[PDB]
Design an enzyme around this catalytic site. Structure first.
Site, mmCIF file in Angstrom:
data_model
loop_
_atom_site.group_PDB
_atom_site.id
_atom_site.type_symbol
_atom_site.label_atom_id
_atom_site.label_comp_id
_atom_site.label_asym_id
_atom_site.label_seq_id
_atom_site.Cartn_x
_atom_site.Cartn_y
_atom_site.Cartn_z
ATOM 1 N N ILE A 295 44.275 37.182 10.492
ATOM 2 C CA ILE A 295 43.281 36.106 10.403
ATOM 3 C C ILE A 295 42.225 36.343 9.293
ATOM 4 O O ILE A 295 41.429 35.442 9.018
ATOM 5 C CB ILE A 295 42.612 35.833 11.781
ATOM 6 N N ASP B 152 20.708 39.195 9.475
ATOM 7 C CA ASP B 152 21.627 38.573 8.512
ATOM 8 C C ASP B 152 22.068 37.181 8.997
ATOM 9 O O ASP B 152 23.264 36.911 9.144
ATOM 10 C CB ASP B 152 22.839 39.484 8.224
ATOM 11 N N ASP C 182 28.026 39.673 12.971
ATOM 12 C CA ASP C 182 27.746 40.553 11.833
ATOM 13 C C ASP C 182 26.233 40.690 11.566
ATOM 14 O O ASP C 182 25.664 40.004 10.715
ATOM 15 C CB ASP C 182 28.513 40.093 10.576
ATOM 16 N N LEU D 214 37.433 34.045 17.916
ATOM 17 C CA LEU D 214 36.797 32.791 17.518
ATOM 18 C C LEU D 214 37.549 32.208 16.312
ATOM 19 O O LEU D 214 37.227 32.516 15.162
ATOM 20 C CB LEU D 214 35.295 32.994 17.207
ATOM 21 N N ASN E 27 27.841 34.030 8.798
ATOM 22 C CA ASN E 27 27.728 34.852 10.004
ATOM 23 C C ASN E 27 27.640 34.008 11.292
ATOM 24 O O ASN E 27 27.633 34.570 12.391
ATOM 25 C CB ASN E 27 26.522 35.779 9.882
ATOM 26 N N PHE F 47 36.412 46.639 4.301
ATOM 27 C CA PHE F 47 36.952 47.996 4.442
ATOM 28 C C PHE F 47 38.395 48.014 4.982
ATOM 29 O O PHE F 47 39.186 48.864 4.566
ATOM 30 C CB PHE F 47 36.050 48.843 5.348
#
Lengths: 315, 264
Positions: B11, B125, B143, B83, B130, B16
């Site tokens: 998805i 953030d 996040d 989600l 986000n 990273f």
């Protein structure tokens, strides 16, 4: 003071494994919810609430029977404990003095890591205690400190990560206290630390190697630094870790390794190992992690160690 | 380690590692698998672990649920809430959003902020990238930010950042209110203010220049909502609970099931 009386009696009812305690849990959580509203703002009734918690010894039984309390109630126990702990009457901190007289509180929190249902909650509160030098001194110098080496190697990552968080804090916060402690229990405490550098777990092996490097480079830990870099088997380990399948692990090892080489007062067994591998280490460091271009410090650090090894001679 | 979960479709390819749609082999429940290669992601382990600490302390239908982490060799598996409705930033890609949609999304962010701020937590953030959507239309926050301005940076996206955060002064929940105001402009205009400039230039502009203002064909309650949030003084900014009772939100925000219309 009114709420204290209800909570004291109801927790003793909950202490019993009887099914009748299901109704008492509602009364215990409601009592803790009321106390949280007083402390966390009005501070008139707060002054009397503290002395009521100390004299009753409730602050001890609440951590002792934390696993029998519901989620909502458990959250309040944490909020109450952390607020009371930061209370200051003049120069004196009354809760730090209380937990100094009642050390069982600290060890109950530390034994908390064994129970996953309360491990993270205990970790937060235990970390709050060790912010103050006397409460950190009690755990550090205890035999129960050695349990961390087993708590950081636990199967659940989250608990194991929280265990290393507290462990790291205990060895880096009170630098004057830690230096004296490490000097006293060196032989036993580093015998245990060696097992962390030997760990099958990548995170445990990386973070322990990083913390070791951090400890040794601190000004307060000069005696410990000199004692660590004097032992020949320690250099052999760092030299073996430079050859690890993980470039991150071998980079973290290089920072512990550089300390052994850069010292002017190197012991003869160390000088012998470095001379026995003199051209081997020259070519190693010349080609070691050449991919790290945006790191001028690492490039200069390698060339310094290459010169230091090339300048080495017999006594 | 891999025996308890089964990775379905990829998805998203993360910074990273990689994120996959998954299913728990034990509870049969659908989850999101975030596999992180701890190699190449030099340091940052402490930052992931800090985010895990915050997420495990969060229990609200307006903040992404965390189920646990598993370590296999050098890879870290993070099990979180699935989600599949994308992000609020993705809703801006097919075209412009009407004031009803903007008010509905902002109301849900405020409901999430109200929980975090009451739990003495700062998101740090807040942006459309986000702000995530379920599939049914549910809006949840994901996040979180970090701590320490030197640790932030040049690497960094300061478009949503509060001026006191850049000024390196003490910041609280009110910093997320600034970020919300920038997100309101982002949901209305498509992109945040000073987007045409380099991030370094925006970083210096924010504490120096006057607070941004929503320009163009946008109603007075929406313009006043942005003006309220985008105040150079954080103590003069309204709380998450205060903005929930705003004239723009109460009049233009409708049901969250209506957001299902935007799934691209």
């Amino acid at each position: 003071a009114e709420i204290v009386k209800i909570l004291k009696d109801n927790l003793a009812i909950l202490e019993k494994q009887d099914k009748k305690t299901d109704k008492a849990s509602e009364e215990v959580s409601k009592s803790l919810q009321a106390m949280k509203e007083i402390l966390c703002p009005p501070t008139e009734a707060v002054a009397q609430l503290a002395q009521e918690l100390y004299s009753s010894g409730l602050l001890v039984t609440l951590i002792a029977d934390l696993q029998l309390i519901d989620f909502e109630g458990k959250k309040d126990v944490t909020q109450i404990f952390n607020n009371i702990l930061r209370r200051q009457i003049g120069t004196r901190s009354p809760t730090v003095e209380y937990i100094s007289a009642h050390p069982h509180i600290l060890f109950m929190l530390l034994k908390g890591y064994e129970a996953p249902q309360i491990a993270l909650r205990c970790g937060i509160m235990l970390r709050e205690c060790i912010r103050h030098e006397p409460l950190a001194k009690i755990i550090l110098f205890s035999n129960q400190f050695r349990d961390f080496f087993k708590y950081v190697e636990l199967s659940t990552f989250d608990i194991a990560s929280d265990a290393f968080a507290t462990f790291k804090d205990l060895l880096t916060r009170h630098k004057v206290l830690v230096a004296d402690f490490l000097e006293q229990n060196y032989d036993t405490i580093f015998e245990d630390y060696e097992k962390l550098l030997q760990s099958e777990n990548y995170v445990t092996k990386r973070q322990s190697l990083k913390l070791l490097g951090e400890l040794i480079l601190d000004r307060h830990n000069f005696a410990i630094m000199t004692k660590y870099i004097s032992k020949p088997e320690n250099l052999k380990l760092m030299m073996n870790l430079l050859r690890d399948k993980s470039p991150n692990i071998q980079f973290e090892a290089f920072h512990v390794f550089k300390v052994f080489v850069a010292s002017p007062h190197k012991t003869q067994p160390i000088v012998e190992i470095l001379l026995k591998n003199q051209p081997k280490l020259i070519e190693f460091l010349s080609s070691f992690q050449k991919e790290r271009t945006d790191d001028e410090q690492f490039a200069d650090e390698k060339n310094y160690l290459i010169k230091q090894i090339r300048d080495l001679k017999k006594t | 380690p891999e025996e308890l979960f089964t990775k379905l479709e990829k998805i998203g390819k993360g910074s990273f590692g990689e994120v996959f749609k998954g299913i728990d082999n034990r509870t049969q429940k659908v989850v999101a698998i975030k596999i992180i290669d701890l190699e190449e992601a030099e340091d940052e382990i402490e930052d992931i672990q800090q985010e895990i600490t915050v997420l495990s302390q969060c229990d609200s239908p307006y903040v992404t649920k965390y189920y646990g982490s598993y370590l296999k060799d050098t890879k870290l598996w993070i099990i979180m809430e699935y989600l599949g409705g994308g992000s609020a930033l993705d809703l801006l890609e097919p075209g412009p959003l009407d004031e009803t949609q903007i008010a509905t999304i902002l109301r849900e962010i405020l409901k999430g902020l109200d929980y975090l701020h009451s739990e003495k937590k700062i998101h740090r953030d807040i942006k459309a990238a986000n702000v995530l959507l379920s599939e049914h239309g549910e809006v949840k926050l994901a996040d979180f930010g970090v701590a320490g301005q030197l640790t932030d940076t040049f690497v960094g996206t300061p478009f949503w950042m509060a001026p006191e955060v850049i000024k390196q002064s003490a910041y609280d929940s009110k910093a997320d209110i600034w970020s919300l105001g920038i997100t309101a402009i982002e949901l209305a205009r498509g992109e945040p203010p000073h987007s045409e400039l380099h991030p370094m230039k925006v970083l210096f502009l924010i504490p120096k220049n006057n607070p941004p203002t929503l320009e163009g064909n946008y109603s007075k309650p929406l313009k006043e909502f942005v003006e309220a949030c985008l105040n150079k003084e954080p103590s003069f900014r309204p709380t998450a609970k205060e903005l929930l009772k705003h004239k723009f939100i109460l009049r233009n925000a409708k049901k969250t099931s209506y957001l299902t219309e935007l799934i691209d």
